[PDB]
């Protein structure tokens, strides 16, 4: 239906098979419609993470340790204080932390309980690990007037270098850093143990693959190409296959959805893996 | 009309005769609809 | 459309030619509908 509340108009559009599902050519359905309503994100508003500082009201102090060492809790020999915090970019992602802060000295291992396997283990890097991700599709935006008044941005045509979106990782760099991480692990498990890395346990696509932001578009990458190694007792580059999705769920808040409008032109964001989220 | 905003569905339900009124089986109406919109 | 959500009725009304515009008796349109919604 168009603005003219009387007669419809046969139109067309492209949709990823991650967004739609077969009912029962064939009939398909927008996946969100079985769970909740979905809202189009405004084409003007962006999602670029911006550095935010936090401040306390008078009578309260922001304390900040400068101790390069920290187990996650305990006394700090070197404590300072600040007016407000440093700028932290709200980078929403999973597994791989992006555009965060760097650690000093050695790789940092922090966990609520290392002896307990149910808890997670935080790993903070010392050196930025470059990752370069690309979506080589110079596609158009056949916007359709689904008013009255309000407009919808559908997917036009896809032209250009029809390749699957993917990420480029410096392999030797990954190997080197991973090793530095294993050193730490050695230091909390023993000088005679074996360390193996593998992908997630599957299940939900959001926890399985790597979810991260990238200029309004949402990427889901198979990090099996990274987390596949091992260490004993004592270019080159990696290509990571990615998928695109227009309908996603943020913070795992069921009962709602959000439709991100496609972006015209080729996209090529850039970030640096600063930390990990191992279990 | 169910969630599928396209095809309707025939259902049934019970209502007290204090809630409904004859229009004009027979045709009946929710009494509130002549005065205002009822919010549940 | 009327309150009786089932059957419609034909009505009439007067409108200044400053308010309406020809589409394409003849067919006309409320001028505001090409720019935005309107509130009474």
């Amino acid at each position, epitope marked *: *239906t168009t603005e003219l*509340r*009387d*007669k*419809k108009q046969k139109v067309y559009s492209l949709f990823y098979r991650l967004d739609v599902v077969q009912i029962n050519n064939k009939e398909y359905r927008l996946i969100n419609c079985n769970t909740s309503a979905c809202t189009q994100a405004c084409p003007k508003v962006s999602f670029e993470p911006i550095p935010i500082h936090y401040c306390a009201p008078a009578g309260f102090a922001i304390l900040k340790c400068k101790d390069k060492k920290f187990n996650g809790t305990g006394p700090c020999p070197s404590v300072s204080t600040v007016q407000c915090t440093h700028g932290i970019k709200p980078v929403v992602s999973t597994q791989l932390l992006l555009n965060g802060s760097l650690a000093e000295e050695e790789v940092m291992i922090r966990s609520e309980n290392i002896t307990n396997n149910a808890k997670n283990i935080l790993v903070q890097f010392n050196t930025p690990v470059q990752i370069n991700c690309t979506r080589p599709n110079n596609n158009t935006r056949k916007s359709i007037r689904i008013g*009255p008044g309000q407009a919808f941005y559908a997917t036009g045509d896809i032209i250009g270098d029809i390749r699957q979106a993917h990420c480029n990782v410096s392999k030797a760099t990954w190997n080197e850093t991973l090793g530095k991480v294993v050193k730490q692990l050695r230091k909390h498990f023993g000088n005679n143990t074996i360390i193996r890395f593998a992908n997630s346990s599957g299940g939900d696509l959001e926890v399985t693959t790597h979810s991260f932001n990238c200029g309004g578009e949402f990427f889901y990458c198979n990090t099996s190409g990274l987390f596949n190694s091992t260490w004993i007792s004592n270019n080159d580059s990696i290509t990571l296959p990615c998928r695109i999705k227009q309908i996603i769920n943020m913070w795992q808040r069921i009962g709602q959805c959000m439709y991100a409008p496609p972006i015209q032109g080729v996209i090529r964001c850039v970030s640096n893996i600063t930390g990990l989220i191992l279990t | *009309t169910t969630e599928l*905003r*396209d095809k*309707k569905q025939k259902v049934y339900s019970l209502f007290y005769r204090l809630d409904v009124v004859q229009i004009n089986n027979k045709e009946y109406r929710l009494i509130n609809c002549n005065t205002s919109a009822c919010t549940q | *459309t009327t309150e009786l959500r089932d059957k*419609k009725q034909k009505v009439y009304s007067l409108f200044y030619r400053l308010d309406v515009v020809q589409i394409n008796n003849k067919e006309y349109r409320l001028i505001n509908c090409n720019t935005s919604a309107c509130t009474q």
Partner: antibody
Amino acid sequence: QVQLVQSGAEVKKPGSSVKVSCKASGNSFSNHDVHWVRQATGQGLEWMGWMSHEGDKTGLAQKFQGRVTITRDSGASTVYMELRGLTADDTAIYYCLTGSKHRLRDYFLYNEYGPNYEEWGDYLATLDVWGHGTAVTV
Amino acid sequence: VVITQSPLFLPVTPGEAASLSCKCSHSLQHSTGANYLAWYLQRPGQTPRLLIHLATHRASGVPDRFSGSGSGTDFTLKISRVESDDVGTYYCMQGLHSPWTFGQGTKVEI
């Protein structure tokens, strides 16, 4: 190649009524519209009425308005046509037959506050299988 | 809603062409573009055979010497190379306006 079977020839007095019946092999009146057409000796075809195979539509010619009832048993196993107030003018062969329809949507106006307003309309497409007819002599 | 078929009676020399007219007081074109007119042949002793449906389509097994044309109010059935099997009465039938109606027929003979 559905086959239609019609009831036998009848002789009726002026002023009485006939009820003609028709069955279709494989219970085809469930899935194909029934028509009634009559023809007097040496004269043209005259369309009498029909029923949709959906069982949601019946219609008659102007001349049979108040004269004719077209009905069917449950499961559409048999179809019937009753003509009353017979005169010599009704002496004819009465045919049962099927046909297709194109239920096209004429009027329509989208609504942006719920379901839309539709107004379907059946339109005859073709006349497929003719029965052998029932001779009614008034 | 009236239908007039013309001519009423048509003698045709074997092998010659024949042209039948069916005209309606009202258009038989639906707003979707289809014309709901059909042609039927009835031979002596037989039930009618469908020749042409939706104005221009031959029915299944109808020889290609029968062809229909026309749109709106005026329709034509052409029979090339007429033979004794083509003898009988030709009826048009409008399917747009309820109640549906046959024309009064054109009688064709050799």
